[PDB]
Amino acid sequence: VPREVEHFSRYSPSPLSMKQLLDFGSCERTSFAFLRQELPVRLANILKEIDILPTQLVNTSSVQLVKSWYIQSLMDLVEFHEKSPDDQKALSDFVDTLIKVRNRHHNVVPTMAQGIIEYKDACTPVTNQNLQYFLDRFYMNRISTRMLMNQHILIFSDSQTGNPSHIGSIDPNCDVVAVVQDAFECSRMLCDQYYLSSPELKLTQVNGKFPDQPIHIVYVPSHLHHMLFELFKNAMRATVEHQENQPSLTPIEVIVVLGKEDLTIKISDRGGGVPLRIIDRLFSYTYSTAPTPVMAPLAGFGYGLPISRLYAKYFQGDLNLYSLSGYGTDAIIYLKALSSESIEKLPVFNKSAFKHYDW
Template sequence: MAAKKKLQESFSKFLIEEVRRWSMMRQTGVSLKYMMDFGSRPSERNLLLSAQFLHKELPIRIARRAVELENLPYGLSLKHAVLTVRDWYLDSFRDLRSFPEIKDSKDELAFTQMINKIKVRHNNVVPAMAMGIKQLKNDLGRKVEPGDLPEIHQFLDRFYLSRIGIRMLIGQHVALHEPNPSPGQVGQIWTNLSPIEVAKNAAEDARSICLREYGSAPEVQIYGDPNFTFPYVPTHLHLMVFELVKNSLRAVAEMFINSDKEAPPVRIIVADGIEDVTIKISDEGGGIPRSGLPRIFTYLYSTANTALDEHSTADEVTMAGYGYGLPISRLYARYFGGDLQIISMEGYGTDAYLHLSRLGDSQEPLP
């Protein structure tokens, strides 16, 4: 009951009713292509239209998540970490709803600064929610199997997918104000992104973490056309490739740690199809048993010993975190119409297939 009381104490009855009303409104999805076309002309008028759209759209998306955070099963809504996240969402909703109508470029600039603060406020949502899930698992006091708690998995998929969308919309609007964008840069989107370049950078970052954890790191070999480019968000692509390469390096490093044989390389292959750009990441790290495959996309399971506490932040990248890398990477892929598949040969290795839609015209999937 204390948590419910806290909600009434911290937030006015009017605000709570307002949140419930806005959570019933219809969301409006946008496509990568639309963001690109719209943002390629960041005129005062376009920035004003964008701000007016966000002024109405963001409260709807944030209200939906705030209401869900209030009504989670197994007492998850009452966990301290989840209450903190809920309060961030309610604060952000209040900030957006109390912002007056946006009529000119002065209003638009003030609105842009405000939504950027909202984005920063929500930086640590993922580790905070992971902390809440960890508290729930401790309370259940039993081993949680992959098929357990399906409602929690479905909620987290919706919640994180929505978070990707909210951060993309805010980040895109804020980035359109950058004074000197690089050639081909439209806000957060690069119209001529080289997947080979992103793969190189992601592989270097993953290898440096592997070196730190294991004292050595397998080689990463990259194959594909170095001149091929397509429109995509580099931060999203880096996050996904980094996660997959990191997992492969870890599997190989652990398999060969006490071996006198040289560790085999991890291979990245970039294929340029008509519909999809596909990035395959292959390793010879022993693979995953078939019984373990259902676990890899769950939020309640991690093979790593996680050192997660109240003070963990999103910036603390470790070799194996709180088991969220794969499910969240798959959501990033799906956000713009792609997907992520893992195929494993136990006793040999694993292939990850990252499919990215190169048409850019699929709508955001709105939970």
């Protein structure tokens, strides 16, 4: 294990709020001084956990690649530790470095998943509670490093400027309903290619906080779109498959509610539901009632739920599923409505994480 990994893994990650991230964008030098230290810390924390995995998983070519990428990215970043933030060439080189790290890490999620599959096909995955624990942490860690680097790149690079209306990747006036409708349409296009029919959307909105106004919050619309798209793929598959005997499809019903503290989105289907017994299983990485695909897939890799939940929890939200077996399912996303309360939820490698590994 390189000395740099051992060192930087001694620190805890420092979580930021969305409010603070929205302020990257209101000093380059301060964001450089922070990130040059924080990205190594977060890479080093997760690399210590990678080292603890089962030998037969850690030795897959896929995990060895992710480890080699993470270690290179840490080194790339530690090379900036001697530079002055007043050094304008250093700042420029730093943006180019984050662009290289971002491009290098582009296929981390699939690569890790692939390794997880080889392991499964050769040894164990859904009944291994340490692997479930690891993957929530690893993938949350990836969400958080990609969020921080992208914020710096999209505000400070010459060439990658993101949506002119966003601050980095954050929309300070995120049109929640419009994101719902867009993710619904994305899901619908895929569902049509699998079934030649898809349910319609019936949507209702309640602005409890500012009555009769458009619902907006400060949010990262790519993360919100991901959660909704995944829950809609699941609702559409459930609905079509359960109603294949019927002349028409029940709509998917969505309600979006803005209250004082929370933004809540409930997605209700008449897709026949799930036994309460298996609800927890559903949020297990790789768990799916569909065959694992080889390769435009609607279902079967078993990532939609646990990953969508990570996105909701990342800024102190949550995602829950309540089902009525024999009828249908309610999926519910909760997001904090205040940017000052939307604080990164980060894994830390410490005694208590290590130990993790009457009625």
